[PDB]
Amino acid sequence: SMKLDIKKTFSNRSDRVKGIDFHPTEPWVLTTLASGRVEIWNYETQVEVRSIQVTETPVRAGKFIARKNWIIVGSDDFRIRVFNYNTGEKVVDFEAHPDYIRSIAVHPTKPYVLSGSDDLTVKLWNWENNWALEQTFEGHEHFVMCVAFNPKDPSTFASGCLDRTVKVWSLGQSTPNFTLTTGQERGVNYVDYYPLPDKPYMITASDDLTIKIWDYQTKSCVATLEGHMSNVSFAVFHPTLPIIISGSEDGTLKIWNSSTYKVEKTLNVGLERSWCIATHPTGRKNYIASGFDNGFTVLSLG
């Protein structure tokens, strides 16, 4: 049971949206496309702030680094690129991995970036040390699809891997603090942390149609969420509302009750397969945004 008030704020068509991110203080959403293009939209005015043809290959990963006025993106050409979004200047451009970059995470306070790659590793970059490669995390046995800092202890992070595991690491140590054997036999596409201090929870999404909730102190599966009818691309906890949001190649977003783990609403936004998700970091208007085959949509909830 739950009362939801979902409003479409802004939706627009584009090539396939593989990455998406909210700016914390400007009403902006970043989209990164399979076409090599990235776009920054003001979703309140519905005007493009800035766009870049970054490369000719897909750009699967993109994040704002607001405290530097940067966007950072990673692409199938193996390269990490950083742009100032006020001038368009390309700040840095380097080969990060010898294979596809699937995911990028930005430390909340330190000048650290994590990149997850088909080269089976996560790499740690320090932009206050000339973008030095500070550490490579080895252990996974297939593509690393998703990396995410623990917002409550960002000296640790999680990596989700097609080898069917999540690994949780400590910066400066070479082996996982623990490995979760998820039982998601088609691999792990996405991993996310519950942001609030009251629960030590993470969540994983898989091609095997399931979503799983984990207690990372007991390493136990709290619940399994079933309902999607094709590959689940992502699942995340909402930063303010008691819900989980997932999206799937079945073309839907699903909103789940985070206490009962039952589905509360299924949305078909009409843009075919769903690939990526973002939630506004301060919970402004409970905004969420998802990228799809045929564009993106920004929704306000509650």
Author numbering: 0 to 301
How is this structure described in the published paper?
Hence, this loss of critical proteins has the potential to compromise ER proteostasis and generate cellular stress. This challenge to normal metabolism is overcome by the activity of the cytosolic coatomer protein I (COPI) polymer, whose repeating unit is the coatomer, a 560 kDa complex of seven distinct gene products (α-, β-, β′-, γ-, δ-, ε-, and ζ-COPI)25–31. Overall, the coatomer functions to retrieve the escaped “client” proteins, such as type I membrane proteins, from cis-Golgi back to ER by retrograde trafficking. In particular, the S protein – a type I membrane protein – is delivered to the ERGIC from both the ER (by anterograde trafficking) and the Golgi (by retrograde trafficking)3,10–12. Here we utilize recombinant SARS-CoV-2 S proteins and tail peptides, including constructs with enhanced mimicry of the coatomer binding motif (clientized S protein), to elucidate the atomic structure of the S-coatomer interface.
Furthermore, our co-crystal structures showed that the Tyr33 side chain of β‘WD40 pushes away the Tyr1272 side chain of the S heptapeptide. This Tyr33 is replaced by a smaller His31 residue in the αWD40 domain. We hypothesized that the replacement of the bulky Tyr33 side chain with a smaller residue would allow Tyr1272 to move closer to the β‘WD40 surface, thereby further strengthening the binding between S and β‘WD40. Therefore, we generated a β‘WD40 Tyr33Ala mutant and determined its co-crystal structure with the clientized S heptapeptide at a resolution of 1.8 Å. Although the S Tyr1272 side chain was indeed closer to the mutant β‘WD40 surface by 0.8 Å, overall, the Tyr1272 side chain was still >4 Å away from the β‘WD40 surface. A BLI assay revealed this was insufficient to enhance S-β‘WD40 affinity. Moreover, this β‘WD40 Tyr33Ala mutation abolished binding to the clientized Thr1273Glu S heptapeptide, suggesting a previously unrecognized role for β‘WD40 Tyr33 in S heptapeptide binding. Moreover, β‘WD40 Tyr33 plays a critical role in stabilizing S tail binding through interactions with the tail Tyr1272 side-chain.
